[PDB]
């Protein structure tokens, strides 16, 4: 360190809006959003700043972007969402924020996945619970034929099994 602090943080304003979001550069990201219409701008793989923030677990950036009009419904080129990226990592608070925006939860991506199948695959119990409560469909299958219960069973995830089964048992039998 030549000065009092590192110079690296002061060079951070050359980063793209996606990298700002990913790395949690709140000040430079906020300023960049004020001055240009860039909050929903996509990079070469169709990823938005919110996707990058979600995928890297940047809770404060996610909150800031949602509070400032970032569209949480957009999908990347692989048909991935901020929701599915966060579900993949088990970032429960990010997932909660996104679910509270009323995003779709059953979009089938080109990897053969859904947020629920990623949450199950990762053994992220709280995400699985929240997703089931927001209407996530446990019968949707991966490319190999595995639904959410199938994955939970095959992978040995006991708590995820219990959660899914309770949910299914809460479904009222049709009597009409």
């Amino acid at each position: 360190l030549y000065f009092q602090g590192s110079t690296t943080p002061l060079l951070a304003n050359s980063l793209s809006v996606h990298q700002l979001a990913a790395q949690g550069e709140m000040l430079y990201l906020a300023t960049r959003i004020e001055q240009e219409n860039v909050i929903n701008h996509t990079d070469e793989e169709g990823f938005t700043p919110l996707m990058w923030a979600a995928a890297h677990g940047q809770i404060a950036v996610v909150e800031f972007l949602l509070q400032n009009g970032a569209d949480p419904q957009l999908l990347g080129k692989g048909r991935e969402s901020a929701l599915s990226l966060a579900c993949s990592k088990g970032y429960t608070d990010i997932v909660k924020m996104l679910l509270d925006c009323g995003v779709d939860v059953n979009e089938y991506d080109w990897n053969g996945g859904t947020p629920l199948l990623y949450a199950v695959h990762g053994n992220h119990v709280k995400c699985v619970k929240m997703l089931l409560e927001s209407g996530a469909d446990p019968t949707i299958e991966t490319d190999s034929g595995y639904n959410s219960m199938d994955l939970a069973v095959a992978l040995g995830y006991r708590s995820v099994q219990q959660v899914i089964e309770s949910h299914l048992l809460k479904l009222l039998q049709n009597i009409k």
Binding site: M51, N123, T142, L155
Partner: peptide, 16 residues
């Protein structure tokens, strides 16, 4: 410095 986008997991395999 740049960080990568994590890739979505392969659902055809056990995670471990």
């Amino acid at each position: 410095a740049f960080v990568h986008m994590p890739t979505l997991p392969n659902l055809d395999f056990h995670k471990t």
